[PDB]
Design a protein around this nucleic acid. Structure first.
Ligand SMILES: [Cl-]
Ligand SMILES: [Cl-]
Ligand SMILES: [Cl-]
Ligand SMILES: [Cl-]
Ligand SMILES: [Cl-]
Ligand SMILES: [Cl-]
Ligand SMILES: [Cl-]
Ligand SMILES: [K+]
Ligand SMILES: [Mg+2]
Ligand SMILES: [Mg+2]
Ligand SMILES: [Mg+2]
Ligand SMILES: [Mg+2]
Ligand SMILES: [Mg+2]
Ligand SMILES: [Mg+2]
Ligand SMILES: [Mg+2]
Ligand SMILES: [Mg+2]
Ligand SMILES: [Mg+2]
Ligand SMILES: [Mg+2]
Ligand SMILES: [Mg+2]
Ligand SMILES: [Mg+2]
Ligand SMILES: [Mg+2]
Ligand SMILES: [Mg+2]
Ligand SMILES: [Mg+2]
Ligand SMILES: [Mg+2]
Ligand SMILES: [Mg+2]
Ligand SMILES: [Mg+2]
Ligand SMILES: [Mg+2]
Ligand SMILES: [Mg+2]
Ligand SMILES: [Mg+2]
Ligand SMILES: [Mg+2]
Ligand SMILES: [Mg+2]
Ligand SMILES: [Mg+2]
Ligand code: NA
Ligand code: NA
Ligand code: NA
Ligand code: NA
Ligand code: NA
Ligand code: NA
Ligand code: NA
Ligand code: NA
Ligand code: NA
Ligand code: NA
Ligand code: NA
Ligand code: NA
Ligand code: NA
Ligand code: NA
Ligand code: NA
Ligand code: NA
Ligand code: NA
Ligand code: NA
Ligand code: NA
Ligand code: NA
Ligand code: NA
Ligand code: NA
Lengths: 132, 172, 156, 142, 337
RNA sequence: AGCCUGUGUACCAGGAGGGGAACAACCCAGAGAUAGGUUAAGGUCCCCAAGUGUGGAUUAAGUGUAAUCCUCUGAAGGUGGUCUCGAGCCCUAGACAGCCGGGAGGUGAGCUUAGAAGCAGCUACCCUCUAAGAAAAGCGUAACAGCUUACCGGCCGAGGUU
RNA sequence: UGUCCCAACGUUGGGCCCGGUGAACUGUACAUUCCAGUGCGGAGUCUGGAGACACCCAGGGGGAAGCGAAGACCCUAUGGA
RNA sequence: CGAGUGGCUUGCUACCUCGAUGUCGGUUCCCUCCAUCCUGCCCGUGCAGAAGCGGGCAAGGGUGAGGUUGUUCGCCUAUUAAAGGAGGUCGUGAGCUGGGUUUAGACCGUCGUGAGACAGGUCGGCUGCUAUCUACUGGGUGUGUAGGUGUCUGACAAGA
RNA sequence: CGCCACACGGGGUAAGAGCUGAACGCAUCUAAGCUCGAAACCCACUUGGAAAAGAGACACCGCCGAGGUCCCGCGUACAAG
């Protein structure tokens, strides 16, 4: 993909429970895979900010529950390094359900979003309330 | 066996060891004719290819040396020429001679210029959509010509559809 | 199963049906082909000669013959020629299908013992040897290497 | 440096094995031998296969090791080692009193032993130890 | 099924034994392109701090922007080419022919060498020129040494001596270039060889760690799960299969780790200055204060503080040089805290 | 099956010594001590005693340098790789191939079919000019055209073809 | 929640060096081996090659079909219980 | 239908060990094979392109994470360039584990008059040793080359 | 778990694409010759490497003195050494 313009230390793994930062009806998401990622014997597939991951809905509307969708990592608790050296971490881990074209399945994005996410997912970015 | 090749009045052919050289108004070509028990020599007005064996393999080479030498006579006199034709269907291909190597640009819209290095004293004169490879050493010309046509080889797509490229129109 | 298990004439001759039972029928359809109404009144007579004594299971005989005669339809279903496979699968063959205990096998098939040089096939043709080709396909399905021998025919 | 060779043999256009065989014979008889122009000695056959044999030898190995030379220098010498009981006192002596060289570091032109000379005029399928060594990856120091 | 997996550790940096010379020895030299010049220099590692730079990369979407970059400070005071060594080409590779020395010697060069008292510079020079006339002259290199004394933070006074190649235009021309440098007093500096912005290869003898386990030494796993409580925590499963009945040298085993020579490739020379502009508040931990000729190297350099490190124009660079990068800030903040 | 079970025989067992890289039973060989000599099997480029032996031929694959064999593989099928021997036919009244020229008309035969003209199908396949030339052997066209085979002549010169 | 991703650092006792004390297991012989081959078909010792200067310290245990136990499995005995 | 190659499976044999060569699966760590799953270079195509399908050279590198099952195998998910197969005493217990196999206890079903039996199922059920030699990882002392200091060379060796 | 660095390009080939070319007047990528062409091979690059028994080279210092060991204060080193 396009450079994120920031170095990331994946803060997530296959099986991690994160927050669904949107109004799709999905509250809690479970990571299932990481797009374009292949690991190494014994290593758990790792995900972080700006990664398109495969997910499954743990919590939310009966209709949305158990559904295997695709999403993007908008926030993580583990720090990330910007070009000026500073680190940046968030209050929680969150992702926003996306479709084939990478357009937020929802209408509104709850909570902030890293700026770096912009440089990769426009329509997601152009839907953000707050962009740090 | 023994074959005697009378050399053209226009020519002078000398030879030391296994190397033969032929010079004419059109140039000079030197070659190595090396095979088991086959002696090549210059007997004044004629070149001699002889050997004591008559087995197939030998007769094959004797015959090969003959056309090789005769071909040299012709190269140093009349010379050798291959004609070619540049052809494109959508992208205007630009063939130019730059230095000691013909260059082809915008082949199938390619940004990267394709090129090949000319062999020996081969002259590649380009005029419009017609090329003319010429020289005294048939070996050099034939290759340069070929190399040129090869230069537009395409394996990825259907040739029948994508036919752009330079081609040998006339063989000497 | 493989020809390897039965292609050698190393066992005793085993053919007395008076002491053998449950012998499978031959797969060979016919022995006389073509114009069997007519007699060998042909100009040319080619033969397929086996070059090593071997055993040929009826399997191979049928497959060989079919592949040859089926091809001889380059001449037509009622063409002018007569084809003959002269050997018959007399030799009964077994298989020990307990381990080596009480291993005398049970009848599983038949095969014909041909000795190097015998002709297994004989065709009769007018100067129209498409038969020579019918045999390059026939020896293709029998164990031994073979010789395609022409007899009455100095029409080369 | 300085080798009182009782005999100086020239390998140029000579069949390595045949030469090597004769050099061992003499070294065992006490003669101090020096082989010259190793880079120019030859071995008949189909280059492709010949090379394969030697490349394999270079590749064969393990912790215990199988040191095989790539220089026409070594090559020639190991060949000679194969023609001597190099592990017996007498054989190590003979082998040690034999040295191969690239080119000719002497003043005298060495001699060409009987039946070891190859006729380039009636022979096209053969190889030069140096060609071999270049293919092995050796550094052409000659 | 047993999933695949690359082996642990490289089999390229072995045997993993203690280095022979604390002072690094290049086994490669740049190509004879530009004008004649010495192909290397040395200094003494001092430490690390960051510098803020202007994105110099023409292809970066951030080109021209601020950017924080780690830098290892290295004191690179002048060195001295005390003699020109000549090599000849022989059937057995290259061999030292002769050497042209000087008379002006650093007051303490004798703490290492038996400094010359009677040497014939011309004869050597002659011998060399006759070899070049004959055409057997192999490359040319200068014996060089450092002036530890010049670096207060570094205890040693005994100078470190290392040979450095001189690649130049023609051989005759650079041969001369060589002699001239030497004749003077051999005194030369980092400015004479490198320019801030260029890429260099930094060699050095890594930080020694003594004997270590395979886990640390080769990066093999530690026993996992229930296996970690049985009496084995950091020992591999086995030394090899039943057959071949011998332990292969490729299996990760305990031993000397660290204090190995390494030539780290393509290091960008951020800045070559002088003074105390790079020094940190409180002083460079376990080193001291910097206030003299210095080089700022991008990222890390092999070796611990005070160790000698050698430079050389990158022999296999990937990028084109981007001379004299704009330094907007160098942190002098203390390395304690 | 280095399997199982007979039979005749010699061997190992219980048989040395020589050969076979090593190796119970494969080759020589049946053996008192010591000594000289000549052979056997096997071997004579080196390791290694004796030939870099002689006349002649083949092989270019390092085939091979492997009697026997659990042990040394290599098969059906294929080969204008190469060497040797034979038979038939054609040829200086000029062959085989190649290159050039010719390949003509009644006539685009009849028939069918809108159509068909060498060449969709069916029938027939006749005669003229001539040194040749099909009522067309193969492509090609909607059908023509166009491109060639057959057939003849020329150029060339020696063996060619099955 | 360090079971794992994926390991790090630290603590204490050992381990290592020194004084003192001071066993056992095991031992046909020879023994620096490695790759192949061969052999009663699973060889440090045979055959062919390769490699190999001697001694010593530490290590984790690949091999000595390692040491430990006249196989509990299986069969046999005109055995036992 | 016919000819083969391999030595992963199974079967056969009974040559080797019954004064014991520790049997599955897994794990860890190392080397290898190619009949190539991906990657490189190619050929054909029922090759427009894109996506494929088949084939050639080729073993440098890679070939991963999880849900049930002791399982191998396999079934299934989602990722992936692809998530290839096989040999090393079915590599690896003087390395681990001990779920299973396989003792002594017990239950069920079936069989048996019964003791008790069943490759039928089920719960529980132990993992010894201070390394002589060899091998290798690293570390030293000596001898040889035949006074010392400093700098090198490079036969060869390792690498993905 | 943080940060830095880890090519390209030459040479020869396979499969393959061709050139010239004969046996076989033609034709033919092959028979002799030649031009290309794989992550594979060689070089390049990194590491080790005078015990390479052909046991190496150079410069200086020294053979009644060059240099080294022990000693002392310590480590950029380290289980003894
Ligand atoms: Cl996954
Ligand atoms: Cl090795
Ligand atoms: Cl020996
Ligand atoms: Cl030849
Ligand atoms: Cl573990
Ligand atoms: Cl007797
Ligand atoms: Cl060979
Ligand atoms: K047993
Ligand atoms: Mg696992
Ligand atoms: Mg396509
Ligand atoms: Mg335990
Ligand atoms: Mg700090
Ligand atoms: Mg701070
Ligand atoms: Mg007995
Ligand atoms: Mg002798
Ligand atoms: Mg062979
Ligand atoms: Mg045989
Ligand atoms: Mg041996
Ligand atoms: Mg017992
Ligand atoms: Mg019992
Ligand atoms: Mg009883
Ligand atoms: Mg054991
Ligand atoms: Mg293959
Ligand atoms: Mg490999
Ligand atoms: Mg096993
Ligand atoms: Mg395994
Ligand atoms: Mg155990
Ligand atoms: Mg074990
Ligand atoms: Mg133990
Ligand atoms: Mg249990
Ligand atoms: Mg259980
Ligand atoms: Mg249980
Ligand atoms: Na039974
Ligand atoms: Na057959
Ligand atoms: Na040879
Ligand atoms: Na080797
Ligand atoms: Na324990
Ligand atoms: Na414990
Ligand atoms: Na074991
Ligand atoms: Na007897
Ligand atoms: Na023997
Ligand atoms: Na061979
Ligand atoms: Na813990
Ligand atoms: Na062991
Ligand atoms: Na087989
Ligand atoms: Na035993
Ligand atoms: Na196991
Ligand atoms: Na591979
Ligand atoms: Na599973
Ligand atoms: Na075992
Ligand atoms: Na155990
Ligand atoms: Na186990
Ligand atoms: Na290449
Ligand atoms: Na030495």
């Amino acid at each position: 993909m396009e450079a994120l313009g920031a170095d990331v230390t994946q803060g997530l793994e296959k099986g991690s429970l994160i927050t669904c930062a949107d109004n799709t009806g999905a509250r809690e998401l479970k990571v299932i895979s990481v797009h374009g990622y292949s690991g190494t014997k014994n290593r758990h597939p790792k995900a972080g900010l700006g990664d398109k991951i495969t997910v499954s809905v743990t919590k939310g509307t009966p209709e949305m529950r158990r559904q295997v969708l695709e999403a993007v990592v908008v926030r993580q608790r583990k720090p990330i390094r910007r070009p000026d050296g500073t680190r940046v971490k968030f209050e929680d881990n969150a992702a926003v359900i996306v479709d084939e074209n990478e357009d937020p399945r929802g209408t509104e994005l709850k909570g902030p979003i890293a700026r770096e996410v912009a440089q990769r997912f426009g329509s997601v970015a152009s839907a953000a309330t707050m962009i740090v | 066996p023994r074959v005697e090749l009378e050399i053209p009045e226009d020519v002078d052919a000398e030879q030391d060891h296994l190397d033969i050289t032929v010079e004419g108004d059109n140039g000079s070509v030197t070659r190595r004719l090396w095979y088991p028990d086959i002696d090549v020599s210059v007997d004044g007005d004629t070149v001699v290819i002889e050997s004591d064996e008559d087995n197939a393999k030998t007769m094959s080479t004797i015959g090969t040396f003959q056309s090789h030498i005769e071909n040299m006579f012709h190269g140093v006199t009349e010379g050798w020429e291959y004609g070619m034709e540049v052809f494109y269907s959508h992208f205007p291909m630009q063939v130019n001679v730059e230095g000691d190597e013909v260059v082809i640009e915008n082949f199938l819209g390619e940004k990267a210029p394709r090129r090949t290095t000319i062999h020996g004293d081969t002259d590649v004169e380009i005029d419009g959509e017609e090329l003319t490879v010429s020289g005294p050493d048939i070996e050099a010309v034939g290759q340069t010509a070929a190399d040129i046509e090869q230069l537009t080889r395409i394996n990825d797509k259907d040739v029948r559809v994508f036919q752009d490229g330079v081609y040998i129109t006339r063989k000497p | 199963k493989p020809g390897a298990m039965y292609r050698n004439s190393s066992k005793p001759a085993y053919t007395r049906r008076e002491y053998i039972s449950g012998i499978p029928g031959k797969k060979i359809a016919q022995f006389d082909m073509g114009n069997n109404g007519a007699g060998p009144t042909y100009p040319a007579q080619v033969e397929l000669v086996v070059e090593k004594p071997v055993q040929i299971r009826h399997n191979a005989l049928e497959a060989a013959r079919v592949a040859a005669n089926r091809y001889v339809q380059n001449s037509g279903a009622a063409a002018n020629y007569k084809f003959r496979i002269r050997k018959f699968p007399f030799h009964v063959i077994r298989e020990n299908k307990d381990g080596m205990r009480a291993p005398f096998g049970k009848p599983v098939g038949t095969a014909a013992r041909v000795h190097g040089a015998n002709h297994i096939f004989i065709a009769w043709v007018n100067p129209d040897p498409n038969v020579e080709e019918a045999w390059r396909r026939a020896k293709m399905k029998v164990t031994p290497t073979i010789n395609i021998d022409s007899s009455p025919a100095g029409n080369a | 440096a300085e080798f009182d060779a009782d005999v100086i043999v020239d390998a140029r256009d000579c069949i390595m094995g045949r030469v090597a065989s004769q050099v061992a014979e003499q070294a065992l008889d006490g003669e101090t031998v020096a082989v010259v122009n190793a880079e120019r000695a030859v071995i008949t056959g189909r280059e492709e296969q010949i090379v394969e044999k030697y490349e394999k030898r270079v590749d064969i190995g393990n912790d215990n090791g199988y040191f095989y030379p790539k220089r026409p220098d070594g090559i020639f010498k190991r060949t000679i080692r194969g023609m001597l009981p190099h592990k017996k006192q007498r054989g190590r002596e003979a082998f040690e009193s034999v040295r191969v060289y690239l080119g000719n570091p002497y003043d005298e032109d060495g001699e060409v032993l009987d039946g070891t000379s190859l006729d380039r005029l009636s022979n096209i399928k053969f190889v030069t130890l140096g060609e071999i060594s270049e293919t092995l990856g050796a550094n052409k120091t000659w | 099924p047993q999933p695949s997996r690359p082996r642990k550790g490289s089999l390229g940096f072995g045997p993993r034994k203690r280095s022979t010379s604390e002072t690094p020895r290049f086994n490669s030299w740049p190509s004879d392109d530009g004008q004649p010049g010495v192909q290397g220099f040395a200094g003494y590692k001092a430490g690390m701090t960051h510098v803020v730079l202007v994105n110099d990369e023409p292809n970066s979407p951030r080109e021209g922007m601020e950017e924080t970059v780690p830098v290892t400070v290295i004191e690179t005071p002048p060195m001295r080419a005390v003699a020109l060594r000549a090599y000849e080409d022989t059937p057995y590779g290259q061999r030292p022919l002769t050497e042209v020395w000087t008379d002006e010697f650093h007051s303490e060069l004798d703490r290492t060498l038996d400094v010359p008292e009677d040497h014939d510079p011309d004869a050597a020079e002659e011998q060399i020129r006759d070899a070049h006339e004959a055409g057997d002259l192999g490359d040319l290199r200068l014996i060089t040494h450092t002036v530890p004394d010049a670096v207060p933070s570094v205890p040693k006074k005994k100078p470190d001596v290392m040979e450095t190649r001189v690649g130049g235009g023609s051989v005759s021309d650079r041969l001369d270039h060589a002699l001239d440098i030497v004749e003077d007093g051999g005194e030369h500096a980092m400015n004479d060889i490198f320019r801030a912005g260029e890429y260099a290869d930094v060699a050095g003898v890594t930080k020694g760690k003594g004997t270590q386990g395979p886990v640390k030494r080769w990066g093999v796993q530690k026993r996992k799960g229930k296996h970690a409580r049985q009496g084995w925590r950091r020992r591999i499963g086995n030394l090899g299969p039943w057959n071949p009945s011998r332990v292969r040298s490729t299996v990760p085993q305990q031993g000397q780790t660290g204090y190995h020579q390494r030539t780290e490739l393509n290091k960008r020379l951020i800045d070559i200055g002088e003074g105390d502009e790079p020094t940190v508040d409180g002083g460079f931990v376990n080193y001291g204060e910097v206030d003299g000729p210095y080089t700022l190297v991008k990222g890390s350099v092999p070796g611990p503080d005070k160790r000698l490190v050698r430079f050389r124009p990158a022999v296999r660079p990937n990028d084109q040089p981007r001379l004299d990068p704009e330094v907007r800030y160098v942190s002098n903040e203390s390395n304690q805290g």
